[PDB]
From a paper:
The [name]/[name] family of proteins consists of mammalian [name] and fungal [name] and Dxo1. [name] enzymes are capable of removing the entire cap structure by hydrolyzing the phosphodiester linkage between the first and second encoded nucleotides, releasing GpppN from unmethylated capped RNA (GpppN-RNA), and they can release the intact NAD+ from NAD+-capped RNA. A single active site is used for all the [name]/[name] hydrolytic activities, which are mediated by binding of the scissile phosphate to two divalent cations (magnesium or manganese) that are coordinated by conserved acidic residues. The eukaryotic [name]/[name] decapping enzymes can eliminate diverse 5′ modifications from RNA, and here we show two additional activities for them: release of FAD and dpCoA caps from RNA (deFADding and deCoAping).
Modeling of [name] into the active site of free SpRai1 based on the mDXO complex indicated that [name] would clash with residues 65–71 (β4-αA loop) of SpRai1. Therefore, to understand how SpRai1 functions as a deFADding enzyme, we determined the crystal structure of the equivalent triple mutant of SpRai1, [name]/[name]/[name], in complex with [name] at 1.9 Å resolution. Good-quality electron density was observed for [name] in the SpRai1 complex, and it is also in a folded conformation. The structure shows that the backbone amide bonds for residues Lys66 and Ser67 flip by 180° to avoid the steric clashes between their carbonyls and flavin, which leads to a small conformational change for the β4-αA loop. This conformational change also enables a hydrogen bond to be formed between the Ser67 backbone amide group and the C4 carbonyl oxygen of flavin. Pro65 and Pro69 in this loop have hydrophobic interactions with the flavin. The flavin and the ribitol groups also make other direct and water-mediated interactions with SpRai1, including Trp93 and Glu128 which are conserved in [name] (Trp131 and Glu164). Residues 131–137, equivalent to helix αC of mDXO, are still disordered in the [name] complex. The bound conformation and position of [name] in SpRai1 are highly similar to those in mDXO, indicating that the two enzymes have a conserved mechanism of recognizing this cap and catalyzing the deFADding reaction. However, loop 65–71 of SpRai1, which contains residues that are not conserved in [name], makes more intimate contacts to flavin.
Author numbering: 0 to 130, 138 to 161, 172 to 208, 231 to 352
The structure:
């Protein structure tokens, strides 16, 4: 029936919106066995793994595949409620769902759909999905496992991506106040001061020159993901086609837009342009939803092309 559309290319060329430094307000850990713990017992330390590590080791016999079902955002609301933290923001969602909105102009092939509801008591707009274990995905999980060390002093080989640590963050993008929950791979040193600049994101990739358009898009997606949670470092394990780790590359998240500056072609999406469009997208979602009573359900869909489409559910 009635559809509302947002076009990436209808966005006027504006100045980049102000974005505050993400502020951690809560954190939690998920045990191997899915017990949610209100502590940082699953937060690991980064330690550089040996070069020429074989990322195939343990696949599939030591691989406990991830659950492969979306998590309801009510988990985060309940964390904040349990800790007595009030939600006076515009959006509550998983970091990765803002990454999808922000990076949609970058990859028209990644099709996705989210569900949105305004909570009647707090007025916040909650967003979730209701809709990853092949060898290449394992290389990524295995790179994280071999590059991290659990807490030992104040506390096997199995690769268990379901065991996680999560930071819940307040971040303002232009006039939209967001509460975002995201997974944190490990920390660079002791957990303090706001800790997110101490956090580290781990990635594995084949190495291409920055002249390569696909390499630049990938780095922009790495940047966007970490930027939204205030992650200070991205550490990339470059691997060859055999899955052997060949080179380690430590990046500061804020350096990725600087590093890419000499390589952008005149048509390319840039960090600043992505932030402008995202800010207009979020204002459009908020305006559209707030034009409905709370507890009205919406879907937000991207199916290629250059628009988002918002539908009221029947
Ligand atoms: C059908 C479906 C299945 C899903 N299955 C999982 C799952 O098994 N485990 C999980 O943590 N989240 C899964 N999700 C996504 C969750 O609902 C939720 O959005 C996410 O866990 C929230 O954490 P974020 O940190 O915001 O997620 P993101 O920023 O999107 O990604 C951060 C990290 O979460 C992991 N991750 C994210 N998405 C998936 C996925 N689809 N499958 C496996 N790992 C993923 C992975 O370690 C990733 O690091 P890396 O990017 O280096 O690969 C699934 C979503 C859908 C629609």
């Amino acid at each position: 029936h009635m559809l509302r559309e947002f076009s990436f290319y209808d966005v006027p060329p504006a100045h980049v919106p102000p974005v505050s430094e993400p502020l951690e307000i809560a954190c939690y850990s998920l045990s191997r066995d899915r017990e949610l713990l209100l502590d940082d017992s699953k937060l690991s330390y980064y330690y550089p793994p040996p070069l020429f590590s074989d990322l195939n080791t343990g696949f599939p016999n030591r691989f406990h595949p991830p659950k492969s079902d979306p998590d309801p955002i009510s988990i985060v609301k309940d964390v904040l409620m349990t800790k007595g933290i009030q939600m006076n923001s515009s959006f509550l969602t998983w970091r990765g769902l803002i990454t999808k909105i922000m990076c949609a102009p970058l990859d028209p092939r990644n099709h996705w759909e989210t569900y949105l509801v305004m909570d009647p008591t707090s007025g916040i707009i909650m967003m979730e999905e209701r809709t990853n274990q092949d060898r290449m995905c394992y290389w990524g999980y295995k790179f994280s496992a071999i590059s991290t060390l659990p807490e030992i002093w104040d506390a096997n080989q199995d690769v268990v991506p379901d065991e996680q640590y999560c930071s819940i963050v307040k971040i303002n993008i232009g006039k939209s106040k967001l509460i975002l929950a995201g997974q944190v791979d490990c920390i660079w040193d002791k957990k303090p001061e706001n800790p997110n600049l101490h956090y580290v994101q781990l990635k594995t990739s084949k190495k291409y020159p920055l002249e390569n358009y696909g390499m630049r898009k990938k780095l922009l997606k790495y940047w966007a993901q970490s930027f939204l949670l205030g992650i200070g470092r991205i550490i990339i394990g470059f691997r060859d086609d055999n899955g052997i780790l060949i080179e380690m590359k430590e990046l500061f998240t804020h350096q990725i837009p600087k590093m890419l500056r000499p390589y952008f072609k005149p048509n390319d999406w840039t960090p600043n342009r992505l932030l402008v469009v995202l800010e207009h997208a979020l204002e459009w979602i908020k305006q559209t939803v707030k034009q409905h009573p709370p507890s009205t359900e919406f879907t937000l869909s991207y199916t290629g092309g250059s628009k988002l489409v918002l539908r009221q559910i029947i």
